[PDB]
């Protein structure tokens, strides 16, 4: 009902974060701006 989701950077496709959403409340792949360390700037991060 709330899986461990892995957010990856859209630019480098580095799996950077592991959060938990609710698959029901927010079924769509989560999109939030966080910075990959290797990129440096906050870039859009999406579920794997």
């Amino acid at each position: 009902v709330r899986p461990k989701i892995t957010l990856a950077c859209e630019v480098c496709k580095h799996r950077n974060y592991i959060t938990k959403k609710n698959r029901r409340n927010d079924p769509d792949r989560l999109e939030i701006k966080k910075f990959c360390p290797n990129c440096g700037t906050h870039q859009p991060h999406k579920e794997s």
């Binding site: 461990k4 592991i18 959060t19 938990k20």
Partner: protein, 63 residues
């Protein structure tokens, strides 16, 4: 008969230049989602083994 070294201790502990026995902290292998990065950093790296366990760790490492 040579004194055999404990393999597990040999693999989990190390000595520094001065001789301090160092170890990595537990709770950093898996189930890392909920752990705040502050806890993960606190657990990161090596620390000297506590004085209480220093004796038995040294005995296991020497023989």
């Amino acid at each position: 008969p040579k004194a055999k070294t404990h393999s597990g201790a040999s693999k989990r502990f190390r000595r520094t230049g001065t001789g301090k026995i160092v170890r990595q902290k537990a709770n950093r292998r898996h189930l890392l989602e909920h752990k705040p990065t502050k806890r993960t950093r606190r657990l990161d790296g090596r620390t000297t083994v506590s004085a209480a366990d220093n004796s038995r760790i040294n005995k296991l490492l020497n023989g």
